Amino acid sequence: KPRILNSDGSSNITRLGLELDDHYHDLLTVSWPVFITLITGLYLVTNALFALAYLAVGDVIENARPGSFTDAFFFSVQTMATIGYGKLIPIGPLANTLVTLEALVGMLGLAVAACLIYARCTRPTAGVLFSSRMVISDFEGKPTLMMRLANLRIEQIIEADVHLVLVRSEISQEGMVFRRFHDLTLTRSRSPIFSLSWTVMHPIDHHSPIYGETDETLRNSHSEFLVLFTGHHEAFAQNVHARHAYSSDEIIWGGHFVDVFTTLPDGRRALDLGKFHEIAQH
Amino acid sequence: PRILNSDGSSNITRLDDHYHDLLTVSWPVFITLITGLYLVTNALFALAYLAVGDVIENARPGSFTDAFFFSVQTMATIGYGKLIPIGPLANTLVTLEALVGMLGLAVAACLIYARCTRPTAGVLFSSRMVISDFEGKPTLMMRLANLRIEQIIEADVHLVLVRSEISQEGMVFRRFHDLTLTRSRSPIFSLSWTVMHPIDHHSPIYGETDETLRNSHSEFLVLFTGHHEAFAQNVHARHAYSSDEIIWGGHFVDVFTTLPDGRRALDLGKFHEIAQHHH
Amino acid sequence: KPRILNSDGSSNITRLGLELDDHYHDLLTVSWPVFITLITGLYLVTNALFALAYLAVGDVIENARPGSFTDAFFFSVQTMATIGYGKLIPIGPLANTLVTLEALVGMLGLAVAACLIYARCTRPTAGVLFSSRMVISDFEGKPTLMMRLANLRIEQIIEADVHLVLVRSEISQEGMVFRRFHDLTLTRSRSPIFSLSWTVMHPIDHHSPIYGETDETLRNSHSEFLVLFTGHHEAFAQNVHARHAYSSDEIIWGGHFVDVFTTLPDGRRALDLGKFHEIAQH
Amino acid sequence: PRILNSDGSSNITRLDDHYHDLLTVSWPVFITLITGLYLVTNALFALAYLAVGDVIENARPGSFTDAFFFSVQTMATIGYGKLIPIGPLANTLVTLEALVGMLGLAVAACLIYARCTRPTAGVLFSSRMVISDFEGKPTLMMRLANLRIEQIIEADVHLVLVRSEISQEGMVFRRFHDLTLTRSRSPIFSLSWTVMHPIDHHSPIYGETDETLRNSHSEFLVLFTGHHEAFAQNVHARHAYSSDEIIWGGHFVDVFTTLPDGRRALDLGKFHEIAQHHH
Ligand SMILES: [K+]
Ligand SMILES: [K+]
Ligand SMILES: [K+]
């Protein structure tokens, strides 16, 4: 039984034409060492280009060796960074018109760097933990499939949403083995304030694709369970999310999630995450 | 005589707002405005020093050229040292010009940032819709795919039927009918997604045919939204179709093939292709 | 009949204790001339304070008249703005330790200014026009209350929401004249793409507080109709909104909104907003 | 033995993450980290010039003090002129130190901005709830008010009943019941808003009394959200109550009085006051 979705929810599927006009997407998605290099490489090339302009207009930099690329590059660097030490200064109106434009490039050039830097950083992780496996035990009468979610950080999550999806290959009346996504109704699909742990539950009633399906049936149909958390974290005043996927083998039947809440020796209620993935039997 | 273009924009010809206009203009036009505003502010500040003292050291007195380039180095905080202010009159404007170039840069980064953090959704739409039997019932279909490795969270498609009809009150107009999709929200959208509208009793296309849709100038509007993982931002895309854009009895070719190694790939070359009859 | 809500939707109601710890709210809400002044005044006071520190540590500025506040202020200004002309320079380690901290103040001080500037600006107006008055005419059988909304800008609005609310004073079983807000169901409460004009409609059926209420009844009960538009504008990639309120007198019965769409002499369909507030009779 | 505090935080004691930690720490601790990181970077760059050439002009050779203050003026782009680099070794680090202080400022503005654009909602909650007859039926009530002139758009209140109960499976736990308010969303919230929960057949408080709620350790959680006009940002507030926080048969005193001139005012001094019996 092949697995289509990874444990992180990513679809393990290649796409043709790996193969820049999507630059803004590329700039935000490349790694930080590559991003620092791109800004570094762009910075030296941009200073190397302005240097030639000072050399092409003639020796218009005092205290600069005529025709020396370094002094023009290091006057550009001192002009681009607005250091303006004082030894190397421009001469006449033409050099200053090249300096007044270079400073304009320095102002706008920094802002685009600040923009790219800012947008790359404000991507806060949700900081929520998923249960290693799913369990199906009776709850309030019906047999209920359930998985757990823990908030690792102290700050609470507002408007917490959970979306449990069963992805499974079925056959239609036409007669094709296509992949179909089923929404699994939950006892609770919205938690106003998510502080600690949230045990998501799917009652298996008349309205459930899992109804009447044994352990062998889920495995032989390549059944997988896609999970999506969404909320508004208080720590960032920003929206955060998390995804995860289970397979038919990762569900254990008759399992009972061990109580995460314990009682400390002192006499205060506490939360032990060491028993978050623990499961009991009945 | 089409009301909606294929991109979603309305065909109807429309017969200060500074903040909107700033982000509206193109990137070259935006770069020009900063330059002009930067030069004029430096030109005005040059006329300031010249029109109240003429204290710019190591510079031709009365020459605006030396004053503009001192104002530049002062607003651009270069401070070479050759051109230096003299007396309280120049030092007062130096303090003000500095306060100008600092607030002036912050507004520059503010406008630049707001213009680039408006990312495209990167979603491809089918060039046509198919009306065929899915599990017996005839269902109107159109599919979309993701053109980026990153996934879109909480993806919502909205399919709207735009057509011209006559009310009981005797006035003809154009109403927008919300089509009921089998799935209105996909929690994780990473590859391709086929959107289906079952044509049942409570369906505005129910009873219609190839001709009746065209005769009423029926048009179909699609709206996709979702939280893109690449940008940590809500992205959206739009598309529209007409009656002549539907191919009855069509089926979208399966875009999921298999590589020689054994890897499952997304064949987006067969995304717009549609075979008729049964397949 | 007194009016509680203004035409802009603002509640015309004073609140006690006009009467800073809510500074962040104050900084964003004060007017721009006041905001520029606050940053200006903070800038001079901050440069005047650093100047005294250079004077209190002793004459440690070359080419500066000893004990002169201006030269210390204008060295601070040249140090705060990082101009560094060259005549006025610090002397010894103590002056430079005061300069290395002043530059740190200049970096952080600019960012807070840039932050306040940015947050004050990214408040885009929705750019949507409301109909001057409401009309109640028959539509699809039932008598339907309706008002119009026009998109002034070219860019379309995504996920456009309209919330029509009837605010009215009623009496409960206890016997109190309180204000009550009624949600008026609409034929359409959501427009995926808002390009041009949107005619909101409230059918007056069995589920409507306006049902069985004449013109005289709405006026004698101080009835008002609060309207809220909400959407995601394409021009800003940001959420925009608008509010508005009508009164019982602003509704005209039997009115028929004149068609906003016309036909140009050329032969193309066009949209004339000159007849947006026009109303016909039947 | 209270599970939720009056602010909404859970009482349960909990038994790198750099980006979260940066915004988490207090404002004084945040200012310190920049200073330390700024000094150490200048100290490292000073050791750079000294450890490869010693070319800082007009400075005591081998003295770290003169090198730190040159590195500062170079990273802080002051460029007085007395201390100037000499040769390619210093000019190369000057170019790099400049690239550092420029990327270093941009991350500084990035972290500062993210920390202040997290505004408080500015919403006051009632210190207690009342269960009284509104239009006959007994309705649980709690009200909130806006402490700012600016209005909140699309305001949503969420009232949740937290209590400990036993399942049919014989295990005792704590379930969260969503209370059904008469109004879950207020489009425009500018003054005061009274939230009511009618106790009907489908109500978890139905049949309960003053004692049964306390005996089951019942607690009430409230969550307010909305789009504040002052910040153009979504603000939220939270609050919680216990069984002992309810006053049965109580009524909130009307907060809308009248001024001598004739103006209608919002009397927030009588916001928490509640009269019993009938009023
Ligand atoms: K500078
Ligand atoms: K400088
Ligand atoms: K200098």
Numbering used by the authors:
A (entry chain B), C (entry chain B): 11 to 29, 34 to 296
B (entry chain A), D (entry chain A): 12 to 26, 35 to 298
Pull text from the paper.
Potassium channels propagate electrical signals, maintain membrane potentials and facilitate numerous downstream cellular processes. KirBac3.1 adopts the canonical fold of a K+ channel, with inner and outer membrane-spanning helices supporting an inclined, shorter, pore helix that supports the signature selectivity filter. All feature an hourglass-like constriction at the intracellular opening, leading to the widespread conclusion that the canonical permeation gate at the helix bundle crossing is closed (or nearly so) in all Kir structures, whether determined by crystallography or single-particle cryo-EM. Thus, data presented here indicate that inward rectifiers (Kir) are able to conduct without requiring the substantial conformational changes predicted by the canonical gating mechanism.
To covalently constrain the dimensions of the hourglass-like constriction, paired cysteine point mutants were introduced into KirBac3.1 upon a cysteine-less background, in which each of the three native cysteine residues were substituted for serine or valine (C262S, C71V, C119V). This allowed us to covalently link the four inner helices into a tetramer without obstructing the conduction pathway. Following purification of A133C-T136C and S129C-F135C, covalent linkages between adjacent subunits were generated, either by direct disulfide formation using Cu2+ as the oxidant or by the crosslinking reagents 1,1-methanediyl bismethanethiosulfonate (MTS-1-MTS), which forms compact linkages (CysS–S–CH2–S–SCys) with slightly more tolerance than direct disulfides (CysS–SCys), and dibromobimane, a rigid bicyclic molecule. To visually inspect the channels for intact crosslinks or unanticipated effects on structure, crystal structures of two of the KirBac3.1 adducts, S129C-F135C-MTS-1-MTS and A133C-T136C-bimane were determined. In both mutants, four crosslinks encircle the conduction pathway at the Tyr132 as anticipated. Both revealed electron density bridging between adjacent inner helices, consistent with the predicted covalent linkages. An overlay of both crosslinked structures onto the native pore is illustrated. The cysteine-pair mutants were assayed under identical experimental conditions to wild type. All eight variants of the S129C-F135C or A133C-T136C mutants, either with reduced cysteine sulfhydryl moieties or as covalently-linked adducts with inner helices tethered at Tyr132, mediated K+ movement out of liposomes, with no significant difference in signal from wild type in any of the crosslinked populations, indicating that crosslinking did not prevent K+ flux through the Kir channels. The differences in rate (and overall signal) between crosslinked and reduced forms of the pore are not significant, which indicates the enforced constriction is not rate limiting.
